[PDB]
């Protein structure tokens, strides 16, 4: 609740093409503003990530090498056409606020793509076009187009594939060809990307979280003037460390605690742990899980 900006992993919330916001997004901590991550905490907006708040974001995942970047990491909306992203971008209805030059997402290939404008141009309110900016200052970050969370995983999902009842096309993916009169609508569809899989769209979203005493399940803080503090400096029980630490019952169950000489205090992050998802009856460990609003066409049978 109070430690939403104490990030798991490195905490990097910048896109590679945009550097000048590194003083406050690299990493994100208790203090400072970050246009790439702050927008994720407006309540009611991004509910799935706000549920699993202590799991990584997309930019956060690519800078922890969990999610790979696509070839050209940014598609142009001013070039000859700038096609590599447009085919995937049109099928999704999104809404970009003003002053944003870039907006990122998980492509259908499982990598992080982004759509970006030339300097001092901004994205329109549908994220499909670039226009000469109307203000004086552009946002120095990239706007996430997906309610999403990510984690490290080695679970092979190459055998997996999108299966949805009565669906002909979901976003880019064409599951089959249909002869019946179709119903077409923008739907908020869930999805998940795995180790060796593409984007797998889902009918139901069934998740389960196994809690553990691993490092990413904790948040440590020292001297509101709180600043983050690496847990790797705290020595475990029967180990060696450079600092001294105290924690809750969960933290002191594994690491040694000293109530008087501790540099920092570590709590157990609520809603943290290994998350698994149920795809067509089988439980798997996904790399990322999210929602996105895409064009779904359905048969009448």
């Amino acid at each position, epitope marked *: 609740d109070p430690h939403l900006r104490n990030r798991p992993g490195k905490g990097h919330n910048y896109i590679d093409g*945009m550097t000048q916001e590194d003083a406050t997004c690299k990493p994100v901590t208790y203090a400072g503003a970050c246009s790439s991550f702050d927008v994720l905490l407006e309540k009611g907006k991004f509910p799935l990530f706000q549920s699993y708040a202590h799991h990584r974001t997309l930019l956060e995942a690519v800078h922890d090498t969990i999610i790979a970047k696509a*070839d*050209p990491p940014s598609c142009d909306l001013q070039s000859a056409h700038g096609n590599p992203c447009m085919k995937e971008k049109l099928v999704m209805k999104t809404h970009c606020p003003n002053d944003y030059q870039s907006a990122h997402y998980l492509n259908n290939d499982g990598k992080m793509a982004s759509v970006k404008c*030339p*300097p*001092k141009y901004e994205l329109t309110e549908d994220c499909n076009f670039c226009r*000469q900016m109307t203000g004086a200052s552009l946002k120095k970050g990239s706007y996430p187009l997906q309610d999403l969370f990510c984690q490290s995983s080695e679970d092979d999902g190459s055998k997996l594939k999108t299966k949805m009842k009565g669906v002909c096309e979901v976003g880019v993916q064409a599951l089959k060809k249909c002869d019946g009169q179709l119903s077409t609508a923008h739907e908020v569809v869930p999805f998940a990307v795995f180790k060796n899989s593409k984007k797998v769209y889902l009918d139901k979203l069934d998740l389960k979280t196994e809690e553990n005493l691993l490092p990413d399940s904790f948040v440590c803080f020292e001297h509101r003037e709180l600043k983050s503090f690496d847990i790797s400096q705290c020595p475990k029980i029967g180990g060696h460390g450079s600092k001294k630490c105290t924690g809750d019952a969960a933290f002191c169950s594994a690491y040694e605690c000293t109530a008087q000489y501790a540099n920092a205090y570590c709590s157990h992050a609520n809603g943290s742990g290994i998350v698994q998802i149920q795809v067509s009856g089988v439980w798997k460990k996904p790399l990322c899980v999210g929602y996105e609003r895409v064009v779904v066409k359905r048969e009448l049978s």
Partner: antibody
Amino acid sequence: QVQLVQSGGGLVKPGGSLRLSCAASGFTFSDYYMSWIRQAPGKGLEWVSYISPGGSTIYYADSVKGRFTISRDNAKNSLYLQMNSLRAEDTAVYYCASSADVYNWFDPWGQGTLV
Amino acid sequence: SYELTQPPSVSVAPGKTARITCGGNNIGSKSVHWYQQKPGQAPVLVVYDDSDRPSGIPERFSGSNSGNTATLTISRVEAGDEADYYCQVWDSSSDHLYVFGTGTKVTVLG
């Protein structure tokens, strides 16, 4: 520190071919676009081509389009420019540059190589 | 094609201030970059993003951009500032995508 360092011969007869190679050491080089900018003797700078961090989506300038081929070997941290069907208008000093995204400002450049 | 115009010569006495104007149609809407090149060298980025400096460039260098003119201003000119200064922009038109100016040679008097 970052040190884009170049090699490659630069004395040929018209219609010939050459090959410049720019080796990178100090950044990741897998996340940065790479461009080639030439400078005629005494004149200013002309951009020639750019290659994306992954190797796909290459762009050339119509002055050079069709003749040169820019490639990269991210494994061995290198960036190649193969020149074919050369002629006197190409005689210049060629530099490699890194931008970190397609719209950006060409931070550190190679040392230069005459042709 | 989008062209950037640049005065070929600029003389300035040491201690005075030097000014170099990059002229492009509607250039206030693009990000302007300034490189410095000494003889026998490679161009070095002295200014990017219309007004900002990479680490290593002294506070003597300042960038500005408005309307149809973007100016690089070198305060406290030193004899070592004799060089070619080039402006550069991105332009997704007519095949160049990175338009360098004609270049300005700054020579220090005295």
